[PDB]
């Protein structure tokens with residue numbers, strides 16, 4: 001029935017057009033509070049985010065899922081304020097990414113489970129704001145710690161009904177190892193979204209996961225250093241495949257009958273401290289439409305390539321509603 | 331003239347007996363706010379700290395230096411509240427230890443200098459509370475990033491007069507490489523305290539740095555896993571040297587004419603999430619006196635060993651005052 005947002009619970013019908021993998025800011029635990037000037041100022045950052053969210057809203061976007069975890073420097077008060085100002089629903093996350101501090105790294109699977117449930121049931125910090133999704137990540141073979149995270153995510157998800165979303169090194173087929181772990185925990189593939197999936201050209205790897213019931217996240221659409229090949233850091237981060245190439249993978253899965261398994265996003269942000277300095281400048285040049293890139297550019301492109309409008313609606317409205325809706329096992 | 335504390339500035343005379351390397355809680359950036367229950371509750375942690383601090387105060391302690399950096403999970407609001415409640419002065423720190431997040435790891439020396447100056451001049455977070463010391467760390471051969479930290483710490487120190495205090499792998503003689511970098515930045519050894527120095531028996535190493543004008547921090551006095559050796563984790567962390575063995579290093583240095591360069595502490599805490607679970611329990615059992623260990627146990631021991639009381643007063647009152655006073659070159 002309900003999905004938790006930074007402003008409280010909403011009905012499924014209110015979610016509307018939803019972007020499933022985004023961020024307001026990409027940072028580190030405690031960073032925004034300790035060194036806000038890094039982003040100009042907190043106020044500057046929020047203003048930027050409000051502007052961008054209002055542009056997306058104008059394009060039809062009603063809800064965004066900010067997959068920033070504790071270690072991505074998620075600031076739930078920042079999220080609640082921009083959500084309120086832009087009038088865009090924002091779903092917050094729990095989980096752990098690739099930069100856990102010692103206090104997290106030394107924890108057992110049981111303790112991590114506890115922390116995840118806490119964020120989901122009790123709320124984040126002392127705000128009472130509850131997480132609506134669990135974010136995990138691997139980059140190649142899972143380290144022993146990552147395996148604990150994955151198990152903990154599965155158990156919290158089994159207890160709550162809240163979905164799991166991941167970061168993958170698609171090219172290395174991480175999705176298959178993640179699936180194996182999740183399944184070993186009893187987790188249903190339909191509660192899981194294997195992200196950054198458009199980062200690969202191997203459709204066989206994709207279709208195989210889709211066939212198992214997993215959701216495939218094609219969330220790096222606008223990421224391309226194409227024409228920027230002169231920037232080591234940019235090219236390393238964004239890649240050299242064109243946005244068109246990534247978008248056609250959406251059509252490809254549709255064509256194979258997996259429309260119900262597709263989730264699309266931009267993986268955008270408004271501030272980014274966990275990388276080289278001034279990186280935002282480059283991204284903003286690369287994708288001036290920011291989070292509105294999907295509705296403004298991708299939808300129309302697909303339409304033109306022959307994808308029927310309703311299919312497009314099912315992908316951006318229906319699939320996400322199903323995914324987000326907390327669902328308990330048999 | 332004045333030293334910055336979490337409740338504001340104090341004059342040097344007001345510092346009195348000062349513990350130079352301690353912590354209220356050993357954690358990680360954002361952890362306390364995100365998972366306070368890991369420590370029972372924020373309240374419980376706070377109550378535990380107030381009692382401990384009141385007990386040290388009863389023993390004569392007037393000021394403590396909490397060397398918790400951003401990456402140690404320093405919560406200045408927590409510090410301000412326990413300080414007020416126990417009536418003990420608390421000096422806060424800036425710097426970086428060994429668990430910096432990516433957002434910090436990717437910064438240049440210039441950016442890091444700016445961040446340290448911010449905490450010292452403008453204040454921590456939005457509190458307006460200013461740091462009165464810079465904490466840095468190495469663990470054997472410095473890493474490239476650690477070299478950047480040390481240089482930025484040096485620069486912030488040269489611009490503000492605030493001292494620098496370090497964590498070393500004493501056994502590995504880290505202090506030597508630290509000194510080299512600081513000196514390469516033009517920093518006076520007298521603005522530096524090389525910590526965890528009682529972690530080693532090498533007096534040759536210690537008198538060498540002392541002879542150079544550096545302050546020697548003997549702050550692991552009560553750390554010992556003797557009898558607790560059935561515990562790998564505790565042993566790894568505490569070592570197997572007795573507190574008396576560490577305490578005698580103090581007497582040794584005094585004997586060599588380095589009384590003015592010694593700074594003693596306990597390196598205690600009331601919460602500890604950055605290690606194995608339940609480690610506190612073990613520590614509390616090893617040193618039930620907590621921060622009062624120094625005045626209750628060490629001072630009398632040294633006295634009994636022949637050290638003059640006045641000397642003891644110089645080490646615990648005079649030395650720290652001089653070290654802490656912001657001093658420009």
Ligand SMILES: CCOP(=O)(Cc1ccc(C)cc1)OCC
Pocket residue numbers: 016017059060061295299312313316317
């Ligand atoms: C099904 C009718 O679309 P929708 O409910 C949400 C929606 C808006 C824009 C696009 C491109 C797709 C979906 O329209 C809102 C006014």
Ligand SMILES: CCOP(=O)(Cc1ccc(C)cc1)OCC
Pocket residue numbers: 346347389390391625629642643646647
């Ligand atoms: C000179 C007298 O020391 P002091 O100023 C601070 C002080 C107290 C106790 C000990 C063990 C050392 C130093 O005593 C005030 C109570």
